[PDB]
Amino acid sequence: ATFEIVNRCSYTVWAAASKGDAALDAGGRQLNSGESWTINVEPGTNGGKIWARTDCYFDSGSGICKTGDCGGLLRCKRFGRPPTTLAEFSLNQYGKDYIDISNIKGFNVPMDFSPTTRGCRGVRCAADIVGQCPAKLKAPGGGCNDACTVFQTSEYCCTTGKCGPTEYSRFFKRLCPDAFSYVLDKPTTVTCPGSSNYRVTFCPT
Fold first, then answer.
1. Which PANTHER family match?
2. Is the previous residue joined to 82 through a cis bond, with omega within 30 degrees of 0?
3. DSSP secondary structure string, the chain?
4. Range of the domain at 190
5. What angle do CA 197, 202, 205 make, to 5 degrees?
6. String of b and e for 127-152 (b: at least 16 CB within 10 Å)?
């Protein structure tokens, strides 16, 4: 499957793509404002994620980013450090693809995640979550942390599977109704035809 990753932000981002235990495609790349990078993701990929990283410095491809850092690598093999707005997908799962956007690991960069082929709609979280972020969730390194990252409670992290919405999750949900705001949120997952192709756009508006 092809994913065109487009940076419409006025600032550079370092795109990242991983399934947690492996890179997808090259795993990461710099995208200056306006640049597009097309990756290939193997059919059947389960639990893949694409995200933006901000304020990165890389030497051999080793360095640091202020949001979304994946163990200091330009080419991510693992998931990124919160806060990270997440484009999430599992492909060719019993004949269908499943996509969503998640704020469960916080928000750093606004994003649209849409199919480029027929049969389903896209999802978007493009509100100014960083600007509106509650004081207690603001990440000093940049972005808006989720409450699990900040407070490490069973309720925010949904550790027992028993959790409800919270004042913090409701903030993310108010700003972005079409993204997951906590682990047990009512799903905003979109079912697409198996083997669809996609575009992830940072700063779509």
1. OS03G0233200 PROTEIN
2. no
3. -EEEEEE-SSS-EEEEEE-SSSEEEEEEEEE-TT-EEEEE--TT--SEEEEEEBS-EE---BEE-SBS--TTBSS-SSPPPSS--EEEEEEEETTEEEEEEE-TT-BSS-EEEEESSSSS--EEE-S-HHHH--GGGB-TTSSB--HHHHH--HHHHTTTS-----HHHHHHHHH-TTSB-STTSPP--EEEETT--EEEEES--
4. 1-205
5. 110
6. bebbeebeeebebeebbbbbbbbbee
| Separation of alpha carbons 89 and 159, rounded Å | 22
Fill in the amino acid letter for 1: A
CB atoms within 10 A of CB 57: 11
Structure token pair of residue 181: 């705001």
Say if residues 82 and 106 touch (Cβ distance below 8 Å): yes
Structure tokens at 191: 């079912």
CA distance 70 to 87: 16
CA of 175: how far to CAs of 9, 12, 63, 111, in Å?
Answer: 19, 24, 32, 13
Position of tokens 């707005």?
85
The method of structure determination was X-ray
| Pair of tokens at residue 196 | 């669809």
